[PDB]
Every structure is written in structure tokens, then in C-alpha cells.
Design an enzyme around this catalytic site. Structure first.
Site, PDB file in Angstrom:
ATOM      1  N   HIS A  41      30.492  38.452  10.036  1.00 41.59           N
ATOM      2  CA  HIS A  41      29.180  39.081   9.874  1.00 41.59           C
ATOM      3  C   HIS A  41      29.272  40.597   9.723  1.00 41.59           C
ATOM      4  O   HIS A  41      28.245  41.204   9.436  1.00 41.59           O
ATOM      5  CB  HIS A  41      28.134  38.608  10.894  1.00 41.59           C
ATOM      6  CG  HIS A  41      28.286  39.076  12.314  1.00 41.59           C
ATOM      7  ND1 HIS A  41      28.119  40.382  12.740  1.00 41.59           N
ATOM      8  CD2 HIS A  41      28.509  38.351  13.430  1.00 41.59           C
ATOM      9  CE1 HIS A  41      28.297  40.436  14.060  1.00 41.59           C
ATOM     10  NE2 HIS A  41      28.540  39.217  14.500  1.00 41.59           N
ATOM     11  N   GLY A 143      27.318  46.375  18.742  1.00 42.55           N
ATOM     12  CA  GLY A 143      28.632  46.940  18.451  1.00 42.55           C
ATOM     13  C   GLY A 143      29.790  46.277  19.211  1.00 42.55           C
ATOM     14  O   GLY A 143      30.946  46.616  18.944  1.00 42.55           O
ATOM     15  N   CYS A 145      30.709  43.010  19.114  1.00 45.56           N
ATOM     16  CA  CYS A 145      31.322  41.888  18.431  1.00 45.56           C
ATOM     17  C   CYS A 145      32.751  42.206  17.992  1.00 45.56           C
ATOM     18  O   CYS A 145      33.071  43.364  17.696  1.00 45.56           O
ATOM     19  CB  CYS A 145      30.523  41.502  17.207  1.00 45.56           C
ATOM     20  SG  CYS A 145      28.944  40.757  17.633  1.00 45.56           S
TER      21      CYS A 145
HETATM   22  C1  OW1 Z   1      27.651  41.976  17.423  1.00 46.52           C
HETATM   23  C2  OW1 Z   1      27.888  43.155  16.871  1.00 46.52           C
HETATM   24  C3  OW1 Z   1      26.287  41.550  17.945  1.00 46.52           C
HETATM   25  C4  OW1 Z   1      26.374  41.450  19.470  1.00 46.52           C
HETATM   26  C5  OW1 Z   1      25.027  41.192  20.161  1.00 46.52           C
HETATM   27  C6  OW1 Z   1      23.976  42.300  20.089  1.00 46.52           C
HETATM   28  C7  OW1 Z   1      23.293  42.315  21.444  1.00 46.52           C
HETATM   29  N1  OW1 Z   1      24.251  41.644  22.306  1.00 46.52           N
HETATM   30  C8  OW1 Z   1      25.199  40.966  21.649  1.00 46.52           C
HETATM   31  O1  OW1 Z   1      26.066  40.259  22.155  1.00 46.52           O
HETATM   32  N2  OW1 Z   1      25.854  40.286  17.357  1.00 46.52           N
HETATM   33  C9  OW1 Z   1      24.737  40.145  16.639  1.00 46.52           C
HETATM   34  O2  OW1 Z   1      23.952  41.068  16.437  1.00 46.52           O
HETATM   35  C10 OW1 Z   1      24.458  38.743  16.094  1.00 46.52           C
HETATM   36  C11 OW1 Z   1      24.647  38.694  14.582  1.00 46.52           C
HETATM   37  C12 OW1 Z   1      23.286  38.475  13.949  1.00 46.52           C
HETATM   38  C13 OW1 Z   1      22.261  38.356  15.064  1.00 46.52           C
HETATM   39  N3  OW1 Z   1      23.054  38.383  16.305  1.00 46.52           N
HETATM   40  C14 OW1 Z   1      22.591  38.124  17.545  1.00 46.52           C
HETATM   41  O3  OW1 Z   1      23.331  38.146  18.522  1.00 46.52           O
HETATM   42  C15 OW1 Z   1      21.124  37.738  17.720  1.00 46.52           C
HETATM   43  N4  OW1 Z   1      21.063  36.432  18.358  1.00 46.52           N
HETATM   44  C16 OW1 Z   1      20.543  35.383  17.740  1.00 46.52           C
HETATM   45  O4  OW1 Z   1      20.084  35.416  16.617  1.00 46.52           O
HETATM   46  C17 OW1 Z   1      20.497  34.066  18.515  1.00 46.52           C
HETATM   47  F1  OW1 Z   1      21.528  33.891  19.327  1.00 46.52           F
HETATM   48  F2  OW1 Z   1      20.507  33.038  17.680  1.00 46.52           F
HETATM   49  F3  OW1 Z   1      19.408  34.003  19.265  1.00 46.52           F
HETATM   50  C18 OW1 Z   1      20.288  38.801  18.469  1.00 46.52           C
HETATM   51  C19 OW1 Z   1      18.828  38.342  18.505  1.00 46.52           C
HETATM   52  C20 OW1 Z   1      20.748  39.028  19.914  1.00 46.52           C
HETATM   53  C21 OW1 Z   1      20.380  40.127  17.718  1.00 46.52           C
HETATM   54  C22 OW1 Z   1      24.355  37.436  13.800  1.00 46.52           C
HETATM   55  C23 OW1 Z   1      24.317  36.116  14.542  1.00 46.52           C
HETATM   56  C24 OW1 Z   1      24.931  37.311  12.404  1.00 46.52           C
END
Ligand code: OW1
Ligand code: OW1
Lengths: 305, 305
Positions: A41, A143, A145
Site C-alpha cells: 500500500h 507511518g 506500517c
Molecule cells: C500504515 C502506514 C497505516 C497504519 C495505521 C494508521 C493508524 N494506525 C495504524 O496502525 N495503515 C493504514 O493507514 C491502512 C491502509 C489503508 C487504511 N488503513 C487503515 O489502517 C484503516 N483501517 C481500516 O480501513 C480497517 F481496518 F479496515 F478498518 C484506518 C481506518 C485505521 C486508517 C490501508 C488498509 C490500505
């Protein structure tokens, strides 16, 4: 004496962490030999997120579209590919701090250490468990991930988790290092919810043994139970079944303390039926399920790396 | 989101740890530049322990009587001296992995990470606090002494603790890196007991703010209190006084959340007077006092090293 939630030393993993930037999105990568591993991603824009076609997004990208930085040093990408939900970026430099390593897929109930990272730099280390519902209860911000989870055996680092996302109750989901998710989760911003969680029974028993070893003994009773009658009571309180393999794995702690696994099961049954009544075990007022039998032995006998 | 007891990354400290053997006694040392630091009780035999004359025991020893090993490599001692309760062994080789470092004496209430070591090798890392009674609640077995506690600021390692002993309730006592004990403890095997402990109020407030930031809000009430009326209620439940400097230090969290420090004090007062009633905060059923304001900010804003 004493018993603490304790992580593995992180130094071997620290020398592997890098920053990966694609357009406007930055996250963390794991540099091993001449490959950098990161969540796919990274190639999405704050836009592509609701429903991305990753195979398509990747076809548009050239090697130069990935900026990889190791501290202050630029690593040139010379190749790129996708495997499940992780990118593999082939770089022109082999990491000279690459540890001895394996990639493993862990099972629910197993514990590991997380090295939480931002911008390719470590923020801290903590221990957690892979829950029965295939989530972990971590601490991760924007940030984070590409942060990884790992075990150490002597000098071999076992990489088992790479962080991808956060689910509604503030719990976390990610992949193994071959890019397959733990649990029924996908890497898109869509309605997803963790299955209901259960308590990891074998770990709670391991923790009760740790309490006896450290001299906390008030909860021991003079009765026994059968595996079957225990498992009826466990199910009622949302505890995993206890299997014969779990009894065999508890064998070392049972031997060391002289308390038979089924005797400790009788004690846990009374704690579940009657509560703890304001008393604590190992300083805690709730039953703790994030220590494996192996974790208890390690801490209580002083195994080193 | 999420909030975990999180340690500093340990890699910088890991490259400093060595084994020090004097006769039959082995423990850990800290190798910085061309000096190895370790507890002076390495020169005692399982005999000298009840009442040792260290100055005398040291007069009999020559350089060769200390075997120092760094992994598989022998370090020749070429000089030795004593400073308070630590030995300084001058060795013929400067450690090439010496970090940027300082020695600091921390105050009660401050937190640090412990790298638990046996035979010069790391077993694990965890975070703890220097209690008001000058003990820590650690996890240490035979052979752990010379394990160190540390903070990191960017790239500077602040060494603040070296482990020496265990006290009756299974709590732990040690020195700064200039060899002065924290608390009224001495390095002899004699009747010693920790003073009664108090709860670090400023840290409990910092933790309540962490709970609000993570969306756990049930304990907030609509009242306020004065600093003086709060401090009457705190004293009754064995909580440290809250000072005006502590209110100033909570300023950033108070600002971020829009809850005035004295409003959060009113909420804590009701928790102390009325209990938590089976409810948890940040997954915990007891009030947690091992997070400083700075620790909360670090984790909740993602500061890196
Ligand atoms: C990585 C950089 C980031 C880490 C998240 C941000 C807040 N805490 C964390 O652990 N990951 C993401 O932003 C991923 C990424 C986009 C959306 N996302 C999410 O974690 C979202 N979660 C969901 O959509 C769900 F789990 F399904 F509910 C968010 C709502 C927390 C932003 C992908 C999955 C491509
Ligand atoms: C260091 C190698 C070792 C670490 C201990 C062992 C068990 N857990 C630990 O943290 N330290 C010692 O053995 C010191 C050393 C001898 C006695 N000692 C103790 O810790 C003892 N404690 C006390 O005597 C007292 F705190 F006062 F109660 C012991 C009873 C736990 C062995 C000195 C102090 C020279």
C-alpha cells in the site's frame, strides 16, 4: 525473582530497518541481503485507498519511483516485484548487518516482539500475542506500517509479522513476510471488524505457574478436575479449549513446581467461577494470557541470545 | 492507536555488554571506550558476602585475576580501581561499538529501560520506574548483576542504573554508574527492607490523559477541585503530593486534550474514593503509575531514535 512483560533485544532487527517513499507516502521497510520488503500500500495515494488495483498501480511504477533510505544513505532500486500484499524491492547494495534469519508463519497464541518504527527509525519495542481472532493489541500510529514482529533463537531472527492496518476497536492486523494476512483481513479501506476474541487458556495456565515459581500461591486449592469438565467451564467464560498437546507443553512447568496440570486447571476453574475478590496475582487484577509456556521458562531460567 | 508498556530499542546498549569473571563469580559488565564497569561484589566469594571489606579484597587482586570476555574475545585488563560500589577495569582495547553516552542520576518517578543480561549476553528488555522508595520492580535472576538501565535521546544513551541486589518483597536495588546506591541500601547480605512505597501521582494523571487520547473517556466528570483539596485526598490513598511543577509538566497533554490538569484531578479523586467498579482503563483494572508525561507524549506522537 519478579515477572515482567519482556521483549527480545532488538539490535539485530534495528540494523535492517529503512525508509521507503513512493510519491507522497512514506513507511518502513525491512532490508535483508539485497532485497527491501514493505507493505504494497506504499504505492497507493491518499485516494486509491478505498478500492485499489495493486497490480495495475505497480505496472505504472519504475525503479526510480521508489526512494529507499538507510539512515542518511540512498539505496538505488534496480528491480521490483509483488508477492501477495508485500513489495520486494531489489537494491544495488547488500545490507552488511543482515542477521541470520528465517520467515515463519506463527499460530494464534504465540507471542513475539514488535519493533515499532517511523521513517525507518525505531521508536520502541514491546511484546504481544497473536490473538485467536488473528489481531494483535499493539501501539501503532500513522507511518508505522512495515514495522515488524520477530522472535530470536540464540542468533537466528525469526521474522513473523509486518504491520499493515488498524481495526475499529483499536487492534491491529498485518501479514507474514510472504505477504499473506493473518485472519480474514484485506488491505483496503473498507468496513472490517475483528471476530470476537477468546482467552488463550494454555497461556493463562503458564502464567499461574510463573506465579507459583515467584511465590504467589493463594489461589491453589486442594481439588482436581478432568480435562472434559474443565473444558465445559472454560467454554462458558470464552476460553479456548485446552488440548492434550497443551498439557504436554505445560509438562516442564508442572514438573518444576510439582503441581499437575489438571490440579492447576481446578484452581483456574474456581478463579473463573468465583472471581479474584480484590486480590492480585503477580501484581495483576486480571488473568494474563500473553505469556506462552516457553516465555515463562525463558524468563524464569534466564535464557540468552 | 493503542497504548503499551514500551521499552527503548536496545541495540546501542547490546554492543557494550561483556562478561566479568573473578575466581568463581561471574556477572555482567558495561564496556565503554577502554573501561569496563561492573558491581564490586564480583570480587567476593560465596562467603565474603555477609560483611565484606571491599578495599581489602581488592588489594589482594592483580589485573590477571579478572577475566573479561566480549562474545568469544578475551579483553586483557591492564588496570583496575574502585569508585563507590562499582569496579572500573581498564582494558587494552577500546570498544569500537561505544555509543555516544552520558551517566545520569535519575529521580524517583522517572522511567527507564532495563537490558536484562546473563554471562554478558542479553536475555530481554523491559521498562520500569524508580519507585518513591528507591526500588524497582524488575525481573532478575542469579547472574543478572551488572545489567543496566538506560534512556535514549536521539543518538545519546543515558546510562542511569546498574543492578546489584534483590530485597524481600521481590523488588530490586542498584546504583548509578558512579557506584552510588539509589535509596538507603548497602551491598552486603544483611537484613534490609524497602521503605513503604507510594503511588506516583503525576504519572497516573499522564496515563489518564493517554486514555483520553486513545478514546477511553468514561471516568471524566463535570467537576473541578483545588490543588490543596486534591492533595488531602491523595495523601489518604498513599499518593505522592502533586506540585505546581508537575502541573506545568502536564501542560502539553492538558493542551492537546483540552482538559485542565485540575479537572483531571477531580476525576482521579472520584476513582480513588469510589473505585473503578469492574471497569477498565486502557485494558487495565488498576491505576497505572509507570508512564511519565514524556513517555505518554513519545508513544502518542511517535518520537524515534
Ligand atoms: C500504515 C502506514 C497505516 C497504519 C495505521 C494508521 C493508524 N494506525 C495504524 O496502525 N495503515 C493504514 O493507514 C491502512 C491502509 C489503508 C487504511 N488503513 C487503515 O489502517 C484503516 N483501517 C481500516 O480501513 C480497517 F481496518 F479496515 F478498518 C484506518 C481506518 C485505521 C486508517 C490501508 C488498509 C490500505
Ligand atoms: C547479582 C549477581 C545478584 C542478583 C540477585 C540474585 C537474585 N536476584 C537478584 O537480583 N545479587 C546478589 O546476589 C546480592 C549480592 C549479595 C546478596 N545479594 C542479594 O541480592 C541478596 N539480597 C539481600 O541480601 C537483601 F537485599 F539485603 F535482602 C539475596 C538474599 C537476594 C541473595 C550482595 C548484596 C553482595
Amino acid at each position: 525473582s519478579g515477572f515482567r512483560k519482556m521483549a527480545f533485544p532488538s539490535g539485530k532487527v534495528e540494523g535492517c530497518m529503512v525508509q521507503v517513499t513512493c510519491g507522497t507516502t512514506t513507511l518502513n521497510g525491512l532490508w535483508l541481503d539485497d532485497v527491501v520488503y514493505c507493505p504494497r500500500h506504499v504505492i497507493c495515494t491518499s485516494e486509491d485507498m478505498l478500492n485499489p488495483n495493486y497490480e495495475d498501480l505497480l505496472i505504472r511504477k519504475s525503479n526510480h519511483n521508489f526512494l529507499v533510505q538507510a539512515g542518511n544513505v540512498q539505496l538505488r532500486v534496480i528491480g521490483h516485484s509483488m508477492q501477495n500484499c508485500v513489495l520486494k524491492l531489489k537494491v544495488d547494495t547488500a545490507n552488511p548487518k543482515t542477521p541470520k534469519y528465517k520467515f515463519v508463519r506463527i499460530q494464534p497464541g504465540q507471542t513475539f516482539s514488535v519493533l515499532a518504527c517511523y521513517n525507518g527509525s525505531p521508536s520502541g519495542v514491546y511484546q504481544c500475542a497473536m490473538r485467536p481472532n488473528f489481531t494483535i493489541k499493539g501501539s501503532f500510529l500513522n507511518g508505522s506500517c512495515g514495522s515488524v514482529g520477530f522472535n530470536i533463537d540464540y542468533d537466528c531472527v525469526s521474522f513473523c509479522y509486518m504491520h499493515h492496518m488498524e481495526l475499529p476497536t483499536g487492534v491491529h492486523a498485518g501479514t507474514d513476510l510472504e505477504g499473506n494476512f493473518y485472519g480474514p483481513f484485506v488491505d483496503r479501506q473498507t468496513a472490517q471488524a475483528a471476530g470476537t476474541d477468546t482467552t488463550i487458556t494454555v497461556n493463562v495456565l503458564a502464567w499461574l505457574y510463573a506465579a507459583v515459581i515467584n511465590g504467589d500461591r493463594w489461589f491453589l486449592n486442594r481439588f482436581t478436575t478432568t480435562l472434559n469438565d474443565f473444558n465445559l467451564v472454560a467454554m462458558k467464560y470464552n476460553y479456548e479449549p485446552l488440548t492434550q498437546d497443551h498439557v504436554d507443553i505445560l509438562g516442564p512447568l508442572s514438573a518444576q513446581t510439582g503441581i499437575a496440570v489438571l490440579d492447576m486447571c481446578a484452581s483456574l476453574k474456581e478463579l473463573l467461577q468465583n472471581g479474584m475478590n480484590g486480590r492480585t496475582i503477580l501484581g495483576s487484577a486480571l488473568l494474563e494470557d500473553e505469556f506462552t509456556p516457553f516465555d515463562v521458562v525463558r524468563q524464569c531460567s534466564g535464557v540468552t541470545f
